[PDB]
Amino acid sequence: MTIEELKTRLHTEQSVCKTETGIDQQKANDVIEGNIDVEDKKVQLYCECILKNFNILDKNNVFKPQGIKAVMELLIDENSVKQLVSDCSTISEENPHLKASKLVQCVSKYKTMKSVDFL
């Protein structure tokens, strides 16, 4: 998957997830820029939607670390991806919606969705 294809795919998922969740554009922008209000319900739903559409969460919110690895190895070096996966794969959160926002927050420390557009 080329960087240009990932840019495009991200825009597409951002669009469909905005529509699915009804999130304000401002809040979607915040998430895209890596500023995740983890407690905000529609932020959670938006994060969840993007993760599910990339198959990183399955339909029952089972987290799939390999899905993160597949996308992030396009963006950062292999060892950093391993570090990201270790850093982000066992967030201490029982509520699947808060887990989804926390997951996007953690991944976004490494690369934000917005930052992919500059590549």
Ligand SMILES: CC(C)=CCC/C(C)=C\C#N
């Ligand atoms: C690939 C998916 C599901 C996550 C968004 C992509 C990026 C680069 C940061 C985050 N969160």
